[PDB]
Amino acid sequence: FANRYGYWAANQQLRMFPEIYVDPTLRLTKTEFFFQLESALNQGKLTDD
Amino acid sequence: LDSPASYLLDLYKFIQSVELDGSNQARKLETRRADIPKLSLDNDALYKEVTALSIVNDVLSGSAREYIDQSGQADKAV
Amino acid sequence: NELRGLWDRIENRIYNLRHNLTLDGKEINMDLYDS
Amino acid sequence: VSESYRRRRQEWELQYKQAEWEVNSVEQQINLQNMQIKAANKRLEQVEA
Amino acid sequence: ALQVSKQSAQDRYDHFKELYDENISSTEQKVIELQSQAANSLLMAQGMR
């Protein structure tokens, strides 16, 4: 209750709708390999190749 | 599902179980400052509940004016 | 909540396309005057 | 560079749409001139009468 | 014409909440992190000695 409106309702709905909580921005432990996908996708404008 | 009431009741049923007793004021004051979980009307009134400062006046004065009645000093004087 | 915002967005955008001539602005009819 | 190319488009996005809306605003000033053209004709015929 | 002129100021105003707020994004954070990560320059040489 430190800050209140909308912040309180999110205490439930951020658990009660998992699709809100699912994103690729996970708590990643796999840092020894998952960085080796991103450093090739690390480009400003790119194509299907 | 969530509402202004599920926010309020998550406070109200939480404060009830703050039980420490004896001579201490806290519940004595809160019950002297009387209001209840079903104060008046119903929860769908909210849009018409929009009101000025005038809402406060009877919460102070409406107990205060009882002093002449309580002390027995006067009654017919409105 | 995202499903309910999404289906109501597409319903509003269909209404706009079904009028067409707004583009949510006013493309076709403007600046006309009389008397 | 990937952020800079993303920032660049916004300066041209604003510049075209403000100019496009002043192309809309000028149309009132040209349409207004019909009233003074009518007034000058409706003025001159009274001296002849 | 006065009702038309309002948009020249109003459209120039009401966009800018997209710039006096959300003034940073996750890509221009990594533009700092990959510079400040050189804090290991206390360690980068030591196997020399």
Tell me the C-alpha distance between E33 and E36, whole Å.
Answer: 5
Residue A49 C-beta-side C-alpha neighbours within 13 Å: 3
Nearest to D32 by CA among C7, B45, E1: E1
Q: Which residues of chain A are within 8 Å of residue D2 when distances are taken between CB atoms?
A: 43-45
Task: Output the six-digit token pair for A47.
Answer: 């194509």
Resolution, expressed in angstroms to one decimal: 4.4
Q: Report yes or no: A1 and B15 within 8 Å, Cβ to Cβ.
A: no
The residues of E whose Cβ lies within 8 A of any Cβ of D are 1, 4-5, 7-8, 11-12, 15, 25, 27-28, 31
CA A39 → CA A45, D5, E17, E27, E37, distances in Å?
14, 19, 33, 13, 16
Long-range contacts of D14-19 (CB under 8 A, 24+ apart): D14/E15, D17/E11, D18/E8, D18/E11, D18/E12
Phi, psi at D42, each rounded to 5°: -70, -15
Q: Per the structure block, which two tokens stand in for C26? A: 């006013």
Residue D23 contacts by C-beta under 8 Å, 6 or more apart in sequence?
none
The 8-class DSSP code of residue B29 comes to H
Rounded to 5 degrees, φ, ψ at B37 are: -60, -15
Q: Write down how long chain D is.
A: 49
Report the candidate in E11, C3, E16 with the shortest Cα–Cα distance to residue A19: C3
Experimental technique for the deposited model = cryo-EM
Type of residue numbered D48: E
**For residues E40 and D47, is the Cβ–Cβ distance under 8 A?**
no
